[PDB]
């Protein structure tokens, strides 16, 4: 019953909402590659505008006619921008220390998932 980093949403039919399974810290984290013809990312804003926390609505659910056979919903951690980091003066809102472990955790969970 894994919180899979990846959920296979076959791109067929029409629902603005296809429910993501992962939990995303911020919008930038989620990337949608359109397998079927060209693995492709819709501009997060232009097609897969983030209509929802557990669902994403591309403006249209691309038809098999478009030929984009599959959509991949992923939560992939960006090592480059720590979502959060600790600096001198900042009082350590405990909440931040927890965000930090979680941001790391997602990078690793992702790692288990790719391999």
């Amino acid at each position: 019953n894994v919180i899979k980093t990846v959920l296979t949403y076959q791109l067929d039919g029409s629902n603005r909402d296809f429910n993501i399974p992962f939990e995303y810290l911020a919008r930038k984290f989620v990337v949608v590659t359109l397998i079927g013809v060209d693995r492709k990312v819709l501009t997060i804003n232009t097609d897969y505008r983030f209509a929802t926390r557990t669902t994403i609505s591309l403006t249209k659910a691309w038809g098999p006619a478009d030929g984009y056979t599959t959509i991949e919903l992923r939560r992939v951690t960006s090592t480059t921008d720590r979502l959060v980091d600790f600096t001198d003066g900042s009082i350590l809102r405990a909440y931040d220390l927890n965000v930090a472990q979680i941001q790391t955790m997602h990078v690793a969970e992702e790692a288990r998932d790719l391999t």
Binding site: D81, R82, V84, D85, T87, G89, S90, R93, Y95, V99
Partner: protein, 193 residues
Amino acid sequence: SYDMNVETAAELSAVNDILASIGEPPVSTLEGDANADAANARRILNKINRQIQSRGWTFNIEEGITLLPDVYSNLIVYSDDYLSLMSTSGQSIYVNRGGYVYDRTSQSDRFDSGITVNIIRLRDYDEMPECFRYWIVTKASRQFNNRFFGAPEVEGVLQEEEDEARRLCMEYEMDYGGYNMLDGDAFTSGLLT
């Protein structure tokens, strides 16, 4: 103490320095919803960031570019992402009537095969040459200072240093653009031949 090359968050460093510009303690992370004083940091940084990137610079501008016409209706979405739309040579036709480019001369909005324009696309606060970055930081700091909780002396010293930093950018740009009064531009190149 030992030889590290680890990189501190680049975006966060900006708002952190903006806060520390007025002596407010540094903020560990841009989350937490409130931190209203910190929030303003993000908003005013990104906004003054569009601002500086608007005034055209010879590296922000992309010299030529085609934007695909929407195939279905021939209307090219004129997003809020592009700062300015300007034609190649002169008398720029396009300006947005509605959300898509509308040619003023044409009296039409839809057109096929696309167009060629010189756009100055929005870029992050990141991805900018360091001189521009420092200029943005000091200008945002002076605004965030004298607007919300201004003091007399800090405002003055900061506006002085901010005008100084303009020079760091305008010098940078001149060398980067590297125009020649004779050889470089068109009217005079012809004369030489």
